Amino acid sequence: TASWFTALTQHGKEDLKFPRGQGVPINTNSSPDDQIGYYRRATRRIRGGDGKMKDLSPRWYFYYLGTGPEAGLPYGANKDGIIWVATEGALNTPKDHIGTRNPANNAAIVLQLPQGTTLPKGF
């Protein structure tokens, strides 16, 4: 269970969020009804240089609605580390026909957004 897309890295202090209508990654292999889902924060820890564990910059992976680690959440559900995005005209239906990616036979799609998308500080 992998995201179809590469991650957004949060270098700043602000959690990811998008104005309504923005934030769905571009995917030419999906249609207007599909453009809806969530980002999920994935945090990694590493052995620091001084020996103590430390956090790396959080990553945010996009998943289509009804897929991925929170495949059961309905759109808009409040849950820490989960933020919601939807393009105008998407259908609030699970996207099982898109699903998630098997790295064995599909590279990640480099995450792109249409120009002029409003990113928070640090993304």
PDB file of C-alpha atoms in Angstrom:
ATOM      1  CA  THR A   1       0.000   0.000   0.000  1.00  0.00           C
ATOM      2  CA  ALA A   2       1.875   3.006  -1.382  1.00  0.00           C
ATOM      3  CA  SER A   3       0.703   6.420  -2.555  1.00  0.00           C
ATOM      4  CA  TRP A   4       0.407   6.900  -6.296  1.00  0.00           C
ATOM      5  CA  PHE A   5       2.466  10.087  -5.835  1.00  0.00           C
ATOM      6  CA  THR A   6       5.738  11.267  -4.370  1.00  0.00           C
ATOM      7  CA  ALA A   7       5.505  12.993  -0.982  1.00  0.00           C
ATOM      8  CA  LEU A   8       5.221  16.638  -0.013  1.00  0.00           C
ATOM      9  CA  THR A   9       7.907  17.450   2.578  1.00  0.00           C
ATOM     10  CA  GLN A  10       7.038  19.850   5.410  1.00  0.00           C
ATOM     11  CA  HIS A  11      10.206  21.833   6.110  1.00  0.00           C
ATOM     12  CA  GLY A  12       8.372  24.500   8.124  1.00  0.00           C
ATOM     13  CA  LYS A  13       6.322  24.376  11.298  1.00  0.00           C
ATOM     14  CA  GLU A  14       2.825  24.558   9.768  1.00  0.00           C
ATOM     15  CA  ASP A  15       0.711  21.484   9.042  1.00  0.00           C
ATOM     16  CA  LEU A  16      -0.322  20.999   5.425  1.00  0.00           C
ATOM     17  CA  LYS A  17      -3.624  22.486   4.338  1.00  0.00           C
ATOM     18  CA  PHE A  18      -5.103  23.694   1.050  1.00  0.00           C
ATOM     19  CA  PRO A  19      -7.803  26.225   0.168  1.00  0.00           C
ATOM     20  CA  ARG A  20     -11.003  24.525  -0.954  1.00  0.00           C
ATOM     21  CA  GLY A  21     -10.629  23.345  -4.531  1.00  0.00           C
ATOM     22  CA  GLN A  22      -6.815  22.999  -4.440  1.00  0.00           C
ATOM     23  CA  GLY A  23      -4.293  20.327  -3.511  1.00  0.00           C
ATOM     24  CA  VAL A  24      -5.288  17.284  -5.581  1.00  0.00           C
ATOM     25  CA  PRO A  25      -2.188  16.065  -7.462  1.00  0.00           C
ATOM     26  CA  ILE A  26      -2.349  16.092 -11.260  1.00  0.00           C
ATOM     27  CA  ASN A  27      -2.891  12.603 -12.710  1.00  0.00           C
ATOM     28  CA  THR A  28      -3.632  12.373 -16.444  1.00  0.00           C
ATOM     29  CA  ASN A  29      -4.802   8.779 -15.839  1.00  0.00           C
ATOM     30  CA  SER A  30      -7.818   9.907 -13.766  1.00  0.00           C
ATOM     31  CA  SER A  31     -11.008  11.770 -14.633  1.00  0.00           C
ATOM     32  CA  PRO A  32     -12.795  14.829 -13.151  1.00  0.00           C
ATOM     33  CA  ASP A  33     -14.981  12.703 -10.846  1.00  0.00           C
ATOM     34  CA  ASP A  34     -11.836  11.158  -9.266  1.00  0.00           C
ATOM     35  CA  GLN A  35     -10.223  14.387  -7.999  1.00  0.00           C
ATOM     36  CA  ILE A  36     -10.655  14.014  -4.247  1.00  0.00           C
ATOM     37  CA  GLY A  37      -8.811  12.489  -1.312  1.00  0.00           C
ATOM     38  CA  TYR A  38      -6.556  13.218   1.635  1.00  0.00           C
ATOM     39  CA  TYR A  39      -2.940  13.750   2.581  1.00  0.00           C
ATOM     40  CA  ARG A  40      -1.657  11.703   5.513  1.00  0.00           C
ATOM     41  CA  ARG A  41       1.355  12.810   7.524  1.00  0.00           C
ATOM     42  CA  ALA A  42       4.134  10.216   7.721  1.00  0.00           C
ATOM     43  CA  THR A  43       6.820  11.048  10.265  1.00  0.00           C
ATOM     44  CA  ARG A  44      10.186   9.323  10.375  1.00  0.00           C
ATOM     45  CA  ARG A  45      12.739   9.140  13.180  1.00  0.00           C
ATOM     46  CA  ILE A  46      16.467   8.661  12.708  1.00  0.00           C
ATOM     47  CA  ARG A  47      19.505   8.139  14.915  1.00  0.00           C
ATOM     48  CA  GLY A  48      20.828  11.676  15.196  1.00  0.00           C
ATOM     49  CA  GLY A  49      24.453  12.691  14.962  1.00  0.00           C
ATOM     50  CA  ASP A  50      24.758  12.985  18.751  1.00  0.00           C
ATOM     51  CA  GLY A  51      23.312   9.483  19.272  1.00  0.00           C
ATOM     52  CA  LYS A  52      19.773  10.489  20.250  1.00  0.00           C
ATOM     53  CA  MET A  53      16.736   9.756  18.107  1.00  0.00           C
ATOM     54  CA  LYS A  54      15.209  12.725  16.333  1.00  0.00           C
ATOM     55  CA  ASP A  55      12.409  13.493  13.895  1.00  0.00           C
ATOM     56  CA  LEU A  56      12.998  14.101  10.216  1.00  0.00           C
ATOM     57  CA  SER A  57      10.866  16.639   8.359  1.00  0.00           C
ATOM     58  CA  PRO A  58       7.327  15.198   8.092  1.00  0.00           C
ATOM     59  CA  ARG A  59       6.233  13.805   4.743  1.00  0.00           C
ATOM     60  CA  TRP A  60       2.663  14.132   3.451  1.00  0.00           C
ATOM     61  CA  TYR A  61       1.422  11.475   0.998  1.00  0.00           C
ATOM     62  CA  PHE A  62      -1.747  11.865  -1.077  1.00  0.00           C
ATOM     63  CA  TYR A  63      -4.344   9.076  -1.191  1.00  0.00           C
ATOM     64  CA  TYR A  64      -7.564   9.032  -3.209  1.00  0.00           C
ATOM     65  CA  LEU A  65     -10.805   9.066  -1.223  1.00  0.00           C
ATOM     66  CA  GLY A  66     -11.636   5.563  -0.036  1.00  0.00           C
ATOM     67  CA  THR A  67      -8.073   4.236  -0.475  1.00  0.00           C
ATOM     68  CA  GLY A  68      -4.869   4.011   1.546  1.00  0.00           C
ATOM     69  CA  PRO A  69      -4.258   3.868   5.314  1.00  0.00           C
ATOM     70  CA  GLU A  70      -7.469   5.795   6.082  1.00  0.00           C
ATOM     71  CA  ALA A  71      -9.540   4.148   3.364  1.00  0.00           C
ATOM     72  CA  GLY A  72     -12.524   4.044   5.748  1.00  0.00           C
ATOM     73  CA  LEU A  73     -12.771   7.764   6.522  1.00  0.00           C
ATOM     74  CA  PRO A  74     -15.495   9.754   4.768  1.00  0.00           C
ATOM     75  CA  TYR A  75     -14.459  13.049   3.245  1.00  0.00           C
ATOM     76  CA  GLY A  76     -14.007  15.773   5.837  1.00  0.00           C
ATOM     77  CA  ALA A  77     -13.483  13.417   8.789  1.00  0.00           C
ATOM     78  CA  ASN A  78     -11.460  15.040  11.565  1.00  0.00           C
ATOM     79  CA  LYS A  79      -8.337  13.041  12.380  1.00  0.00           C
ATOM     80  CA  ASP A  80      -4.846  14.218  13.275  1.00  0.00           C
ATOM     81  CA  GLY A  81      -2.343  14.008  10.439  1.00  0.00           C
ATOM     82  CA  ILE A  82      -5.192  13.790   7.877  1.00  0.00           C
ATOM     83  CA  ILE A  83      -6.134  16.761   5.700  1.00  0.00           C
ATOM     84  CA  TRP A  84      -8.684  16.793   2.890  1.00  0.00           C
ATOM     85  CA  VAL A  85      -8.539  18.130  -0.681  1.00  0.00           C
ATOM     86  CA  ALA A  86     -11.053  18.096  -3.515  1.00  0.00           C
ATOM     87  CA  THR A  87     -11.211  19.615  -6.959  1.00  0.00           C
ATOM     88  CA  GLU A  88     -14.407  21.309  -8.099  1.00  0.00           C
ATOM     89  CA  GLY A  89     -16.746  18.701  -9.541  1.00  0.00           C
ATOM     90  CA  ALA A  90     -15.379  15.574  -7.884  1.00  0.00           C
ATOM     91  CA  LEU A  91     -17.818  12.933  -6.647  1.00  0.00           C
ATOM     92  CA  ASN A  92     -17.792  12.012  -2.957  1.00  0.00           C
ATOM     93  CA  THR A  93     -17.472   8.314  -3.772  1.00  0.00           C
ATOM     94  CA  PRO A  94     -14.630   5.916  -2.917  1.00  0.00           C
ATOM     95  CA  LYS A  95     -12.050   5.572  -5.682  1.00  0.00           C
ATOM     96  CA  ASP A  96     -11.394   1.814  -5.538  1.00  0.00           C
ATOM     97  CA  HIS A  97     -10.922   1.809  -9.309  1.00  0.00           C
ATOM     98  CA  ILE A  98      -7.752   3.870  -8.786  1.00  0.00           C
ATOM     99  CA  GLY A  99      -6.674   2.248  -5.525  1.00  0.00           C
ATOM    100  CA  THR A 100      -3.085   2.449  -4.317  1.00  0.00           C
ATOM    101  CA  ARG A 101       0.233   1.744  -6.052  1.00  0.00           C
ATOM    102  CA  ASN A 102       2.332  -1.427  -6.109  1.00  0.00           C
ATOM    103  CA  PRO A 103       5.993  -0.216  -6.274  1.00  0.00           C
ATOM    104  CA  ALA A 104       6.887  -3.564  -7.893  1.00  0.00           C
ATOM    105  CA  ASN A 105       5.233  -2.556 -11.185  1.00  0.00           C
ATOM    106  CA  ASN A 106       4.605   1.213 -11.036  1.00  0.00           C
ATOM    107  CA  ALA A 107       6.825   4.158 -10.240  1.00  0.00           C
ATOM    108  CA  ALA A 108       5.398   6.964  -8.139  1.00  0.00           C
ATOM    109  CA  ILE A 109       3.983   9.883 -10.102  1.00  0.00           C
ATOM    110  CA  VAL A 110       5.951  13.030  -9.296  1.00  0.00           C
ATOM    111  CA  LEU A 111       3.527  15.217  -7.346  1.00  0.00           C
ATOM    112  CA  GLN A 112       2.519  18.305  -9.340  1.00  0.00           C
ATOM    113  CA  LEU A 113      -0.203  20.900  -8.766  1.00  0.00           C
ATOM    114  CA  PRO A 114      -1.564  23.434 -11.284  1.00  0.00           C
ATOM    115  CA  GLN A 115       0.319  26.713 -11.260  1.00  0.00           C
ATOM    116  CA  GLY A 116      -0.627  29.332  -8.694  1.00  0.00           C
ATOM    117  CA  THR A 117      -1.661  26.786  -6.061  1.00  0.00           C
ATOM    118  CA  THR A 118      -1.441  28.283  -2.554  1.00  0.00           C
ATOM    119  CA  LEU A 119       1.135  26.225  -0.511  1.00  0.00           C
ATOM    120  CA  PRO A 120       1.618  26.865   3.213  1.00  0.00           C
ATOM    121  CA  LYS A 121       4.948  28.172   4.406  1.00  0.00           C
ATOM    122  CA  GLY A 122       7.482  25.359   4.332  1.00  0.00           C
ATOM    123  CA  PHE A 123       6.130  23.160   1.507  1.00  0.00           C
TER     124      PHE A 123
END
